[PDB]
Design an enzyme around this catalytic site. Structure first.
Site, PDB file in Angstrom:
ATOM      1  N   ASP A   9      67.856  31.789  37.049  1.00 45.01           N
ATOM      2  CA  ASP A   9      67.953  30.761  38.076  1.00 45.01           C
ATOM      3  C   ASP A   9      68.026  29.418  37.349  1.00 45.01           C
ATOM      4  O   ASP A   9      67.059  29.005  36.716  1.00 45.01           O
ATOM      5  CB  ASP A   9      66.671  30.795  38.915  1.00 45.01           C
ATOM      6  CG  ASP A   9      66.571  29.688  39.994  1.00 45.01           C
ATOM      7  OD1 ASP A   9      67.550  28.926  40.192  1.00 45.01           O
ATOM      8  OD2 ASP A   9      65.494  29.611  40.589  1.00 45.01           O
ATOM      9  N   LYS A  69      72.491  19.480  37.062  1.00 45.52           N
ATOM     10  CA  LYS A  69      73.168  20.381  37.949  1.00 45.52           C
ATOM     11  C   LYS A  69      74.062  19.671  38.957  1.00 45.52           C
ATOM     12  O   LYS A  69      75.077  20.163  39.422  1.00 45.52           O
ATOM     13  CB  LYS A  69      72.157  21.289  38.659  1.00 45.52           C
ATOM     14  CG  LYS A  69      72.756  22.413  39.505  1.00 45.52           C
ATOM     15  CD  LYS A  69      71.708  23.357  40.023  1.00 45.52           C
ATOM     16  CE  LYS A  69      72.211  24.428  40.898  1.00 45.52           C
ATOM     17  NZ  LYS A  69      71.107  25.404  41.191  1.00 45.52           N
ATOM     18  N   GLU A 151      72.199  31.920  45.287  1.00 49.54           N
ATOM     19  CA  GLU A 151      70.752  31.828  45.328  1.00 49.54           C
ATOM     20  C   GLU A 151      70.094  32.571  46.538  1.00 49.54           C
ATOM     21  O   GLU A 151      69.145  33.313  46.319  1.00 49.54           O
ATOM     22  CB  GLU A 151      70.297  30.363  45.242  1.00 49.54           C
ATOM     23  CG  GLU A 151      70.581  29.808  43.814  1.00 49.54           C
ATOM     24  CD  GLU A 151      70.665  28.266  43.729  1.00 49.54           C
ATOM     25  OE1 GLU A 151      70.328  27.595  44.711  1.00 49.54           O
ATOM     26  OE2 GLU A 151      71.136  27.780  42.684  1.00 49.54           O
ATOM     27  N   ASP A 174      65.072  27.229  51.695  1.00 48.31           N
ATOM     28  CA  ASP A 174      64.889  26.999  50.246  1.00 48.31           C
ATOM     29  C   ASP A 174      64.717  25.482  49.979  1.00 48.31           C
ATOM     30  O   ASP A 174      65.683  24.722  50.009  1.00 48.31           O
ATOM     31  CB  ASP A 174      66.105  27.548  49.492  1.00 48.31           C
ATOM     32  CG  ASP A 174      65.990  27.496  48.000  1.00 48.31           C
ATOM     33  OD1 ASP A 174      65.261  26.618  47.468  1.00 48.31           O
ATOM     34  OD2 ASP A 174      66.634  28.332  47.343  1.00 48.31           O
TER      35      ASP A 174
HETATM   36  N1  ANP Z   1      51.963  24.478  44.901  1.00 52.90           N
HETATM   37  C1  ANP Z   1      52.908  23.587  45.198  1.00 52.90           C
HETATM   38  N2  ANP Z   1      52.858  22.772  46.259  1.00 52.90           N
HETATM   39  C2  ANP Z   1      53.838  21.910  46.549  1.00 52.90           C
HETATM   40  N3  ANP Z   1      54.951  21.757  45.825  1.00 52.90           N
HETATM   41  C3  ANP Z   1      55.084  22.578  44.784  1.00 52.90           C
HETATM   42  C4  ANP Z   1      54.095  23.534  44.384  1.00 52.90           C
HETATM   43  N4  ANP Z   1      54.549  24.192  43.291  1.00 52.90           N
HETATM   44  C5  ANP Z   1      55.754  23.639  42.973  1.00 52.90           C
HETATM   45  N5  ANP Z   1      56.070  22.637  43.871  1.00 52.90           N
HETATM   46  C6  ANP Z   1      57.265  21.811  43.858  1.00 52.90           C
HETATM   47  O1  ANP Z   1      58.428  22.603  43.890  1.00 52.90           O
HETATM   48  C7  ANP Z   1      59.513  21.776  43.398  1.00 52.90           C
HETATM   49  C8  ANP Z   1      60.370  22.524  42.420  1.00 52.90           C
HETATM   50  O2  ANP Z   1      60.936  23.651  43.147  1.00 52.90           O
HETATM   51  P1  ANP Z   1      61.842  24.727  42.448  1.00 52.90           P
HETATM   52  O3  ANP Z   1      62.144  25.744  43.487  1.00 52.90           O
HETATM   53  O4  ANP Z   1      61.239  25.164  41.187  1.00 52.90           O
HETATM   54  O5  ANP Z   1      63.118  23.878  42.143  1.00 52.90           O
HETATM   55  P2  ANP Z   1      64.608  24.269  41.710  1.00 52.90           P
HETATM   56  O6  ANP Z   1      64.718  25.714  41.690  1.00 52.90           O
HETATM   57  O7  ANP Z   1      64.958  23.551  40.511  1.00 52.90           O
HETATM   58  N6  ANP Z   1      65.544  23.917  43.028  1.00 52.90           N
HETATM   59  P3  ANP Z   1      66.352  22.580  43.359  1.00 52.90           P
HETATM   60  O8  ANP Z   1      65.536  21.342  42.854  1.00 52.90           O
HETATM   61  O9  ANP Z   1      66.436  22.422  44.854  1.00 52.90           O
HETATM   62  O10 ANP Z   1      67.777  22.625  42.691  1.00 52.90           O
HETATM   63  C9  ANP Z   1      58.887  20.547  42.755  1.00 52.90           C
HETATM   64  O11 ANP Z   1      59.029  19.473  43.668  1.00 52.90           O
HETATM   65  C10 ANP Z   1      57.414  20.960  42.613  1.00 52.90           C
HETATM   66  O12 ANP Z   1      56.494  19.892  42.581  1.00 52.90           O
HETATM   67 MG    MG Z   2      66.078  26.637  43.556  1.00 56.44          MG
END
Ligand code: ANP
Ligand code: MG
Length: 365
Positions: A9, A69, A151, A174
């Site tokens: 991912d 990205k 995804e 998501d």
């Molecule tokens: N326990 C939690 N409570 C609230 N937010 C959280 C928690 N754990 C992680 N996050 C948040 O989740 C986010 C990251 O999400 P994640 O799904 O890992 O992103 P990604 O896959 O890179 N997707 P995207 O940013 O949409 O391209 C960040 O804003 C974190 O601070």
């Molecule tokens: Mg994601």
């Protein structure tokens, strides 16, 4: 040529790698012991740093690249500056390849074998150029990209929805760090069809962080004027770290304490922060962000010409879906259904990619 196919991912905010092991997907830890790695790359000539160490300099280092990205599929370049003052232009493919290379490298060490094959995920809305950029990034990183999958499909694979006995309509909500995607999938005969998508590619958990930053900045302003706080990059890095930490603690607790001694200085001495932030206040501050996630749900229902009761399953994906208010909002929009969050929502997409990799490699034990 027929070895392991890892699942990746490649997120805007974070990345994650998984592999099939003994007939179950395993999420692999990076060298800092973490199951996800920031999608952030810092350049110092030929020394390239990825992940947590780069996130710690994201505000302070001008040669640290975030959010690459967002440029994938375009011919935009990012610039970094060499020691000798010359400028190095990088493609989004090249920067993404560094993230993929880092994941590959630590995966190889954990598994105990060289890895040359991957499935990489992308948003459902990616077009051919965006998908091709992603494949290229993989190739630069030494990975044969066996398949690019969406995804939300990956998340459904992780939950085994393809194995359902009847046709299923599945809502995927998501909410990541940078983007918000709602997808309605139709799964029938083990095949996936994206019926509708909606959301906002500028809405994500960062925005919730930024509201806490805004709030702290307003608190500081009650006692201090003319600080020019933004120009203090060190202060800004600390505020971003504190905000994200406070937000995360409020998913589990009803209050959190923000403590920032010596945040910056004025002519009367140090500026400090000691603030208790309750879950209720955090939720009031962030209500407009939360509410902006509601209409995309209804959008996909409308476009797919379904009734709400036709949604068979809901999947929560993305780290931000750990927030209680987010869970409640989703429940309110699909009455009667219990959303799925049993698979760690910031690992579920990589897990699905790894399952897809196992399927492509063949061998049923
Ligand atoms: N326990 C939690 N409570 C609230 N937010 C959280 C928690 N754990 C992680 N996050 C948040 O989740 C986010 C990251 O999400 P994640 O799904 O890992 O992103 P990604 O896959 O890179 N997707 P995207 O940013 O949409 O391209 C960040 O804003 C974190 O601070
Ligand atoms: Mg994601």
């Amino acid at each position: 040529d027929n070895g392991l196919i890892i699942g990746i991912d490649l997120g805007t905010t974070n990345s994650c790698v998984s592999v099939m092991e003994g007939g179950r997907p395993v999420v692999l830890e990076n060298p800092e012991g973490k199951r996800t790695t920031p999608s952030i790359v810092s350049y110092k000539n030929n020394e390239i740093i990825v992940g947590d160490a780069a996130k710690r300099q994201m505000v302070t280092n001008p040669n640290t690249i975030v959010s690459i990205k967002r440029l994938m599929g375009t011919s935009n370049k990012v610039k970094v500056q060499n020691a000798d003052g010359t400028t190095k232009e990088l493609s989004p493919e090249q920067v993404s390849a560094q993230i993929l290379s880092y994941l590959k490298d630590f995966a190889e060490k954990k598994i105990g074998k060289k890895i040359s094959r991957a499935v990489i995920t992308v948003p459902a809305y990616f077009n051919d150029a965006e998908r091709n950029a992603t494949k290229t990034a993989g190739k630069i990183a030494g990975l044969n990209v066996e398949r690019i999958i969406n995804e939300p499909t990956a998340a459904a694979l992780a939950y085994g929805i393809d194995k359902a006995s009847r046709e299923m309509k599945v809502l995927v909500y998501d909410l990541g760090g940078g983007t918000f995607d709602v997808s309605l999938l139709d799964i029938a005969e083990g095949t996936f069809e994206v019926l509708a998508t909606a959301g906002d590619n500028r809405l994500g958990g960062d925005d919730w962080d930024n509201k806490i930053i805004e709030y702290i900045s307003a608190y500081i302003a009650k006692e201090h004027q003319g600080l020019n706080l933004s120009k203090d990059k060190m202060a800004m890095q600390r505020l971003k770290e504190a905000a994200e930490r406070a937000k995360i603690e409020l998913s589990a607790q009803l209050e959190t304490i923000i403590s920032l001694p010596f945040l910056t200085v004025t002519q009367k001495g140090p500026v400090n922060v000691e603030l208790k932030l309750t879950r209720a206040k955090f939720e009031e501050l962030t209500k407009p962000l939360l509410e902006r996630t509601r209409n995309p749900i209804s959008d996909v229902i409308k476009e797919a010409k379904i009734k709400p009761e036709e949604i068979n399953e809901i999947l929560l994906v993305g780290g931000s879906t750990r927030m209680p208010a987010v869970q409640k909002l989703v429940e309110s929009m699909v009455p009667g259904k219990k959303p799925n969050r049993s698979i760690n929502p910031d690992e579920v997409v990589a897990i699905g990619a790894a399952i897809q990799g196992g399927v492509l490699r063949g061998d049923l034990e």
